[PDB]
Design an enzyme around this catalytic site. Structure first.
Site, PDB file in Angstrom:
ATOM      1  N   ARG A   1      -3.280  -9.818   5.779  1.00 10.67           N
ATOM      2  CA  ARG A   1      -3.733  -9.957   4.404  1.00 10.67           C
ATOM      3  C   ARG A   1      -2.660  -9.473   3.466  1.00 10.67           C
ATOM      4  O   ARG A   1      -2.268  -8.300   3.554  1.00 10.67           O
ATOM      5  CB  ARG A   1      -4.991  -9.124   4.198  1.00 10.67           C
ATOM      6  CG  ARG A   1      -5.559  -9.181   2.798  1.00 10.67           C
ATOM      7  CD  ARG A   1      -6.805  -8.307   2.718  1.00 10.67           C
ATOM      8  NE  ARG A   1      -7.350  -8.353   1.364  1.00 10.67           N
ATOM      9  CZ  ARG A   1      -7.007  -7.573   0.353  1.00 10.67           C
ATOM     10  NH1 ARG A   1      -6.078  -6.638   0.464  1.00 10.67           N
ATOM     11  NH2 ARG A   1      -7.595  -7.782  -0.829  1.00 10.67           N
TER      12      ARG A   1
ATOM     13  N   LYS B   1       0.824  -1.208   0.000  1.00  7.63           N
ATOM     14  CA  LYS B   1       0.000   0.000   0.000  1.00  7.63           C
ATOM     15  C   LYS B   1       0.845   1.239   0.000  1.00  7.63           C
ATOM     16  O   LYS B   1       2.090   1.188   0.210  1.00  7.63           O
ATOM     17  CB  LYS B   1      -0.951  -0.007   1.201  1.00  7.63           C
ATOM     18  CG  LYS B   1      -2.045  -1.033   1.012  1.00  7.63           C
ATOM     19  CD  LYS B   1      -3.150  -0.896   2.041  1.00  7.63           C
ATOM     20  CE  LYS B   1      -4.302  -1.830   1.744  1.00  7.63           C
ATOM     21  NZ  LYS B   1      -5.306  -1.768   2.818  1.00  7.63           N
TER      22      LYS B   1
HETATM   23  N1  LIG Z   1     -10.267  -6.541   5.193  1.00 12.94           N
HETATM   24  C1  LIG Z   1      -9.519  -5.786   4.294  1.00 12.94           C
HETATM   25  N2  LIG Z   1      -9.847  -5.930   3.017  1.00 12.94           N
HETATM   26  C2  LIG Z   1      -9.125  -5.177   2.171  1.00 12.94           C
HETATM   27  N3  LIG Z   1      -9.261  -5.126   0.808  1.00 12.94           N
HETATM   28  C3  LIG Z   1      -8.346  -4.246   0.415  1.00 12.94           C
HETATM   29  S1  LIG Z   1      -8.049  -3.756  -1.214  1.00 12.94           S
HETATM   30  C4  LIG Z   1      -6.720  -2.501  -1.158  1.00 12.94           C
HETATM   31  C5  LIG Z   1      -5.343  -3.160  -1.314  1.00 12.94           C
HETATM   32  O1  LIG Z   1      -5.233  -4.414  -1.258  1.00 12.94           O
HETATM   33  O2  LIG Z   1      -4.407  -2.342  -1.541  1.00 12.94           O
HETATM   34  N4  LIG Z   1      -7.628  -3.759   1.466  1.00 12.94           N
HETATM   35  C6  LIG Z   1      -8.128  -4.331   2.599  1.00 12.94           C
HETATM   36  C7  LIG Z   1      -7.824  -4.252   3.937  1.00 12.94           C
HETATM   37  O3  LIG Z   1      -6.845  -3.439   4.457  1.00 12.94           O
HETATM   38  N5  LIG Z   1      -8.545  -4.992   4.783  1.00 12.94           N
END
Ligand SMILES: Nc1nc2[nH]c(SCC(=O)O)nc2c(=O)[nH]1
Ligand SMILES: Nc1nc2[nH]c(SCC(=O)O)nc2c(=O)[nH]1
Lengths: 273, 264
Positions: B237, B203
């Protein structure tokens, strides 16, 4: 917190990355090329070492160690502004390294060799005191502790006193728990988990876990496959306020340290415990 | 001791889990190949959506979303023992995903679409409550208040606390300094006694700090993951599964040697 040497200072308010420059087997040109790459990658200290810390090798002669180390320290000091740490146990190498511009005496044997303490005191340079159980030839046969943290901590108390008695003031000292030096896997993680508690001495903490068996044995991966583990180690130690991180992989470590510093600077108390 | 339950299995949160990001883009064959690689690399949860579900991605009809998501969830649930998180905001997709084996509802819009909360409640599945809105008075305080509010809203809809996970939503309406404030104080979100999920992988909070592009952020992403896991984050994640699993092993070995099993 700051260290002073050779008319400059090192500002330890954020973590420093110390790049490893092994000069055990053109040798001088190649060493300087590698130094240059590490500086460019953001290393602020270069650790120059010409005796292997391996289990069965004959000790290198004083003449051979001087030949490997001094021209390298010299060439780096006269080209770059980076700090130079010298990884030696020999008084003559200590003396001669200071003369050509070394900033830190990094002895894995904590100046135990005859004359080494007096030589380090004479140079007036910062000195790193590293914990090792036994000696490099046999320290990995059967490492044993009743309490590894307390035993390492006691060692630091004793070694500090020894240095002070020789005229080396506390302000010149750094402490390193000596990951992998007479330690099994669980000993190493016990020390890493409690690293912040070594701050009670109010001295700089230096750690070296890069590509070591404490990663290899945990992950079951070979020496070239340990970068991710080495970064995790570096981050864990730096989050606990370790001042200097000794590594092979400089660029990656410096990047991780920037993330650590941004986190520590947003935290009210500046440290994890 | 903390655990989640879904679809007749459980996830043991006594150590950090790595959740791999799966793109849904033949699409089925490829999605299952990628799931397989992530499982092999040690991911214990697969988050189904990736580029198709990022903020700013094109919206699709209910029928199209069902056609892209449900066969992927289904194929993974049939072949592997891994947990599956599904990225959706639509009640129908929530319902149909649960029917074919999804374990966790991951809605970055916080169940705001009409009927989404009621559908999530009906499934009985774990639900991730992610903060999104940059200006804040006290970013932590706002994110904390948001969790209090969203917990109450879920409980009112019949979704018990034991089903919830909290995620401060790195990068979601947050500048660089907001993101590091939340990361530095992450351990304080343990007062809810809920699982913490974080996603910082690749990010801008890394890119902007290091001044590197999206493919050059692995070392920074690992540092973020370690920092959060050392503070007891339960699920991380990520795009880079193998590397993150290795870093998590190091964190686990450190936390196990600590009398406290956590950094604060
Ligand atoms: N739960 C959760 N789901 C997400 N989906 C995305 S998409 C943006 C990216 O992957 O840069 N970010 C997140 C996060 O921080 N937490
Ligand atoms: N101060 C300090 N000096 C070192 N020299 C070596 S050599 C072994 C290797 O790099 O695997 N390790 C260390 C260390 O941990 N601390």
């Amino acid at each position: 917190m700051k260290l002073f040497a050779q008319g400059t200072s090192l500002d330890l308010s954020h973590p420093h990355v110390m790049g490893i420059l092994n000069v055990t087997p053109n040798s001088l040109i190649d060493a300087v090329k590698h130094a240059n790459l590490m500086i460019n990658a953001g290393a602020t200290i270069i650790d120059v070492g010409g005796e292997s810390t391996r289990p069965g090798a004959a000790e290198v002669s004083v003449e051979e160690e001087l030949q490997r180390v001094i021209p390298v320290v010299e060439a780096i000091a006269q080209r770059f502004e980076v700090w130079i740490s010298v990884d030696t146990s020999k008084p003559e190498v200590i003396r001669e390294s200071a003369k050509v511009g070394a900033h830190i005496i990094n002895d894995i044997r904590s100046l135990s060799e005859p004359g080494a303490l007096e030589a380090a005191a004479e140079t007036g340079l910062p000195v790193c005191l590293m914990h090792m159980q036994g000696n490099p030839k046999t320290m990995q046969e059967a490492p044993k502790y009743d309490d590894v943290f307390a035993e390492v901590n006691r060692y630091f108390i004793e070694q500090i006193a020894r240095c002070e008695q020789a005229g080396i003031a506390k302000e010149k000292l750094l402490l390193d728990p000596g990951f992998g030096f007479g330690k099994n896997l669980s000993h190493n993680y016990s020390l890493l988990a409690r690293l912040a508690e070594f701050h009670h001495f109010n001295l700089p903490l230096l750690v070296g876990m890069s590509r070591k068996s404490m990663i290899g044995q945990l992950l079951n991966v070979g020496p070239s496959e340990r970068l991710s583990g080495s970064l995790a180690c570096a981050v864990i130690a730096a989050m606990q306020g370790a001042h200097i991180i000794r590594v092979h992989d400089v660029k990656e470590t410096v990047e991780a340290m920037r993330v650590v510093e941004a986190t520590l600077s947003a935290k009210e108390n500046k440290r994890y415990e």
